[PDB]
Design a protein around this ligand. Structure first.
Ligand SMILES: NC(=O)c1ccc[n+]([C@@H]2O[C@H](COP(=O)([O-])OP(=O)(O)OC[C@H]3O[C@@H](n4cnc5c(N)ncnc54)[C@H](O)[C@@H]3O)[C@@H](O)[C@H]2O)c1
Ligand SMILES: NC(=O)c1ccc[n+]([C@@H]2O[C@H](COP(=O)([O-])OP(=O)(O)OC[C@H]3O[C@@H](n4cnc5c(N)ncnc54)[C@H](O)[C@@H]3O)[C@@H](O)[C@H]2O)c1
Ligand SMILES: NC(=O)c1ccc[n+]([C@@H]2O[C@H](COP(=O)([O-])OP(=O)(O)OC[C@H]3O[C@@H](n4cnc5c(N)ncnc54)[C@H](O)[C@@H]3O)[C@@H](O)[C@H]2O)c1
Ligand SMILES: NC(=O)c1ccc[n+]([C@@H]2O[C@H](COP(=O)([O-])OP(=O)(O)OC[C@H]3O[C@@H](n4cnc5c(N)ncnc54)[C@H](O)[C@@H]3O)[C@@H](O)[C@H]2O)c1
Lengths: 267, 267, 267, 267
């Protein structure tokens, strides 16, 4: 029971192939009591999360909605019971308008589109920490999902820029969270075949972008000394759970790579 | 004559202590023919640039203004003469609303403020490249100003996040500029006593932020094996000129540190 | 029981303040069956390890001794029983002759001294992997101890160089270990008050080196958003155990920072 | 005349395809007065350097020879004239025994071989700085040649480890050189078709190593936004000259990448 007795909020579930779905499942398998947040399609999300090993309250959260964020801590407290606080928070949220990715030229993404993507994908990590820190216990843990942006790559375009911003935000959140005895880290995962990504490989963002992303994935498994299985989010979910546990108690403002070791190898 | 015969656009002059003022002066000393761009206070900027060693046309450019950007290449061509192209572009532009810096808590910066700062400080590097690449010669060079954001620090807050985004943007601009035979790099400078920074040390953004920034500067000179003089922008200007020259012809998508070597030393 | 059922070799115990002593203790608390290796003073080491929660066989290993390394796998198999293999290996070994550290000038360390330090501190990580991989199970884990060498610092001198080499060796060991389904990682720890380090703060390597190291420690706790306690090796031991567990199964060739978050913060 | 009036020592010439040969040629084209050092085959080296644009004294230097190093400053002073000092030093020296590279397994390199390679390839950067700093002018520059070792790669094996050590040594040399008003930097170059490398592509170190290195080169040009020509050392030589000039006066303990931008791009 890695997370026995811990109360953990998990955002970012939209389908059963969501990385956050697997994070939630493994966390419950390890004894965590969950509260879920979902964006927009709550009926869908409730139906999806019915399949989790245990029941978990579902709260609505649009990270671009200031009213949602202002009320979030109160709604969470209602859900877990007055006198109880969170031990863990999982940020598994990301989005970039199509103009900011794929075959649409990098220079052709309008700032309003870029700004929306950075809002949801980077700023909201700070938004969620602001909302939830006042209801977190000492020794608590905030975790976000990263895709290694240290080098540029085809197709990912402005989403890669958004991840660069997220990594910087994480280091500042660590400074704030430290006052509460709370850690803040990112997990940089290898590529995972979510619905959206499958759609992209299938050409949803242009044939050229599809081809490059497919090449990107193949080179990843090739580089990874222990391989990489894009169809399996479990090793990622387990890593997130390691950061939510008491077993990395001196790590904060940092990035843990769950990518098969691909980023440490050139060829 | 390091830049003999080169035509170079320099943005970012606002006072005589602007880093871009020193970049422009050294470039002219080295034989460059300049075109300047300025934001908002053009009468002031013209009066300031009258002091440069040579005359240089001044064009208006608000990087948040789409009309300015759409017309920029045409206005530059008018200024340098049909048939002539730029060999160099200097981006020396940065801004973050006060809510995103200083003693104002990190979590209290409203996204609209953050988004404005990222627009001017990061996105606009791509905006300027889009506008100017069609009028740049092969072997050309685009340079932007960076402040090392790889670690978080007091007071700089969201401006540090904006610089993280800028570094990512630079790597993508390099991909685009490469098609034109053009390089794109950043110069990461140590802290420089511009008007704004002097104002901040003087408490303009809060006493606590002032104190931290003053401590930040002192530790910098201490760490730098060859020292660091915050009152002297010349070593920075020379580094920018090195990148505009033909002498780093295989460097692109990169960051050159002009910081006295401070970033490579821990204590 | 984080390590229930796992068989783990732990090197590097010399006193009760050794980092490896705490790694061994926490591992036993979590259900691991240990085999220990020790260098030179085996009577001392046996007497020290008598205090561990459980009994554990002690084998002699001088990593500079080719005969010791050639026989190591056989002696380990004898200790754990034919048919059984290791699930984990901890490398907690480091040394640099005094000429390579402290107030002795950097340029005055003779290569023979440097070479000895690099042999014990970096090459031996590969030596131990070569010896033990043939007797490790798939899903196994090799962990070594690192001190972040990405920036230079006073006093540590050639030991910092040795750590840079170690980090590079780790990435190559990951390539080799991957063929066995085995991971290889380093834990970069903050400074810990071992006997040797206390001796150094006390002036054993010169007053100037003592003063700098004491300053180094103070700045560390200051920078760490969750603080850093140099007198407590437990948070480091727990991190090593996390890497020996099944909970970071997609991380290899990497560095996990157990340093209070100090390395991600500038001031 | 980028280097007009400067006196510069250049090591590492062995054939006309040596990177140091091109560094020397470009430096002379830019007005530098050179002193050369060579290892072992001095008749060959003299005959090769006869082809440089200007005459230059050739001194013998085996960096593993303490007598050579002890006498080096005296011999250089003799060559350039009492009262004159060096403004620049180029370290272009590297070697690793065959057991430490290619298809020979990583684990099978004997430490004595590794230690020799690290001595010549990393330690000697410090050796040369120790010897020459006492005869360098303020504003002087020391430059060494690097091959980016931040990620592991096939075939390069222990030479990659040696480069990791070199990068760490450079940061410490910067600390020492700073007391003399002297800078120390590395140039990380893309792969260059020297004699040795051609031999390796041709299978001199095994067919598998040959194939991997050939693949390595192809991916490099592919990744580089401005391309990479392995048959042309000139862009590398020019970058080294930029660091020897007065145009990067605030850069020390650093690495400048002359690699076509390949290291900043993933695919
Ligand atoms: N799939 C990959 O290859 C991959 C790799 C590394 C990192 N990541 C990251 O993992 C995280 C989860 O992505 P995923 O791959 O599971 O995709 P996903 O589509 O399953 O999940 C993304 C989630 O973000 C939510 N979201 C979008 N806008 C929102 C808003 N305004 N307010 C609240 N929620 C909003 C969506 O509802 C969705 O649940 C993202 O940050 C993603 O960038 C993904
Ligand atoms: N001063 C430092 O310590 C320091 C250190 C490292 C990097 N930098 C960077 O150097 C660059 C120049 O800054 P500086 O220190 O010379 O300050 P500065 O105030 O002198 O110059 C900043 C410039 O940005 C311009 N600008 C703001 N909004 C604009 C817009 N909408 N459109 C066009 N221009 C706009 C301003 O007019 C001004 O000319 C900035 O990117 C800054 O972040 C500064
Ligand atoms: N103490 C710190 O501040 C600190 C910080 C980060 C990393 N580390 C690393 O942690 C590891 C353990 O160091 P420690 O601080 O526990 O010091 P320690 O003195 O307690 O342990 C070092 C061990 O290395 C062993 N050793 C030396 N030469 C050997 C050889 N020839 N063969 C086999 N073993 C040999 C010694 O016997 C000793 O047991 C080292 O790699 C050290 O660099 C220490
Ligand atoms: N060729 C490449 O792809 C490449 C890429 C990046 C960096 N580099 C580096 O550039 C530098 C020059 O290498 P190169 O490619 O020109 O190869 P090269 O063979 O032409 O030059 C290597 C030089 O090192 C010298 N040397 C070897 N042992 C010595 C010793 N004991 N004392 C003094 N000198 C000694 C040799 O005489 C030779 O002149 C090396 O550090 C190399 O690692 C090479």
């Amino acid at each position: 029971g890695l997370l026995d007795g811990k109360r953990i909020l998990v955002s970012g579930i939209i389908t059963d192939s969501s990385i956050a779905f697997h994070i939630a499942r493994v966390a419950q398998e390890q004894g965590a009591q969950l509260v879920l947040t979902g964006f927009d399609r709550l009926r869908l999300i409730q139906r999806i999360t019915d399949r989790l090993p245990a029941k978990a309250p579902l709260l609505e959260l649009d990270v671009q909605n200031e009213e949602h964020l202002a009320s979030l801590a109160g709604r969470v407290t209602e859900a877990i019971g007055a006198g109880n606080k969170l031990d863990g928070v999982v940020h598994s949220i990301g989005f970039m308008p199509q103009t900011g990715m794929g075959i649409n030229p990098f220079f052709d993404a309008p700032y309003a589109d870029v700004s929306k993507g950075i809002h949801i994908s980077a700023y909201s990590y700070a938004s969620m920490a602001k909302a939830l820190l006042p209801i977190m216990n000492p020794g608590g843990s905030i975790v976000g999902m990263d895709f290694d942006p240290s080098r540029a790559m085809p197709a990912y375009n402005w989403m890669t820029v958004a991840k660069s911003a997220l990594e910087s935000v994480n280091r500042f959140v660590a400074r704030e969270a430290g006052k509460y005895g709370v850690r803040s880290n990112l997990v940089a995962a290898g590529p995972i075949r979510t619905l959206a990504m499958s759609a992209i490989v299938g050409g949803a963002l242009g044939e050229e972008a599809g081809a490059q992303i497919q090449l990107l994935e193949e080179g990843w498994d090739q580089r990874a000394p222990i391989g990489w299985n894009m169809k399996d989010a479990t090793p990622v979910a387990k890593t997130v759970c390691a950061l939510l546990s008491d077993w990395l108690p001196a790590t904060t403002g940092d990035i843990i790579y769950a990518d098969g070791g691909a980023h440490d190898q050139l060829l």
